[PDB]
Nucleic acid binder design. Sequence first.
DNA 1: GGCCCTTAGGGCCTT
DNA 2: GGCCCTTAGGGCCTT
Lengths: 213, 216
Amino acid sequence: PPRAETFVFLDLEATGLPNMDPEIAEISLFAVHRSSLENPERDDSGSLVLPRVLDKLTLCMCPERPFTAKASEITGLSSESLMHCGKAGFNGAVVRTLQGFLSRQEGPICLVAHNGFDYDFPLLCTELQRLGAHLPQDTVCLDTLPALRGLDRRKSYSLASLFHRYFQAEPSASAEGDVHTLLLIFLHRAPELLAWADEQARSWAHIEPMYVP
Amino acid sequence: PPRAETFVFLDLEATGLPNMDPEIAEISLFAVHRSSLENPERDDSGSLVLPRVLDKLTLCMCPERPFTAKASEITGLSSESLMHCGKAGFNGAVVRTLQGFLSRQEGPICLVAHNGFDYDFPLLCTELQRLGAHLPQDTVCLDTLPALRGLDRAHKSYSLASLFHRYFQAEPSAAHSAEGDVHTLLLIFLHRAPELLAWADEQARSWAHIEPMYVP
DNA sequence: GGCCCTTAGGGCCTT
DNA sequence: GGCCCTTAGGGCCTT
Ligand SMILES: [Mg+2]
Ligand SMILES: [Mg+2]
Ligand SMILES: [Mg+2]
Ligand SMILES: [Mg+2]
C-alpha cells in the first residue's frame, strides 16, 4: 500500500449497467494533490471549497453499442448526439490524453470513484485493455462506498444520499457534476478517508476487466 | 478560410502583463462542437446553459520566473502553492495532453480567447515554441474583443466583465479563475452565437500566422 | 503593443 | 456481481 500524493476523482457515464455490456460515454477526472486534502480550503462563511490548484479533464465519447432506456435519461447523452458532435469512441486519443493528464500529476496516484470496485474501475479497465493501454504501476484505487460504510461502525450510502446528510442541501445536476459532489464528500471526511486509502488502497494492476472485448 | 467545426474556448492565467515576459500558470479549454453553438440551449429560468457534449481541460503549472504582486493576487496562485501541489512547468506532459485533447476534437479547430490576439494567443505560441510543439494546421484563431466591437458597428466597455453585466445583467461566479473565465466567455459567445459564428467563418486568423509574445 | 475615440491626448484590454 | 442483511432469501450500489 504505497502513499498516494495525488488523488484523482473520477466518474463514468455509460450506456447502462454491467449487463449491457456498457461503454464509457463521458469520462471526468478531478486531480487534487494530497496537500489540499490534508488542510482543506474554506470560505469566509466558511463552507467547504474545492482546491485552487485543481487539474481537470473531461472527454465525451460515442459508444459502439446504443444506450439503454434509463441510462440515456439520466445522462442526457444519445449515441447520435455524441456522433453529431464528432466525438469518436474510446480510442487511442483518449488514452494519450488520459495518460498525459495523469502524467501531469505527482505520483503515486490514487483513483477515487464512488462504488468504483463494482463499476467505474472495472468499466475503465475493459476500455483500457482493449487498446492495450496501461496506467502507471504504482497507481492505487479507493472506493468511497466500502470506506465510508466501514468507518461509520438502517442507513443509506448512495452518492446523492451521502451528500444530503453531510451537506444539508442537495447536489447540482453530468459526469463532472458527480465528481464534484464526490470530491466534496471526500473533503468532509478527508483525514479519515486519507487514512483508509493509505491502508486499503487496491493496486490498479489488480483490477479485473468487467467484460472481455 | 477553413469552416471551423469545433470551437475551443480558452483562457490563461499568467504571471503578469506582456511587458514582464509572463509565463502560463494555468490553462483551461472548453471544447464545443459547432452544432451546439448553432442551437444555444437555455434553462427554464431561462438563462443560457452550457452544451451537454462538452470537453474540458484544466492544467495548473508552476512558472519559472515569479508572479507579480497583482498577478498572484487576482489568480489566487503562487509559485509556492503550485510547487506545493507538485506541479511542474510547461513541459512535454502539457503538450502531449493538450495535443491529445485537441486531436479528440473534430477539425478544423477554432481557438477562442477574449483579447486573444493581444495576450492569450501569442503567449500560448511562445510556450509552445520553446518545446518545439505546434497545434495542428487548418486551425484558426477567433478574438471576441474586436469581433463584438466590429459587430456593434452595424448600428462602452468591452471587457469580459462588462460584457457579462451588459448581456446578462448578473455577476460571474469565479473571477480570474481560468475555468471560470472560459465559462464566462462561452456564455457571452452563445448570446451572440449566430453573429460570432459568421465572424469566425468570414475572418478568423490562422494559428500558423500567430507571432510569439517573446523568444527565450 | 495595438486598436479605440472625441489635441503628438487619453485610455482600453489582457494578468 | 460483490456484499451485508435475517418454495436456491433480497436489497443495496453504480448507469
Ligand atoms: Mg459513478
Ligand atoms: Mg455519473
Ligand atoms: Mg483572459
Ligand atoms: Mg482569466
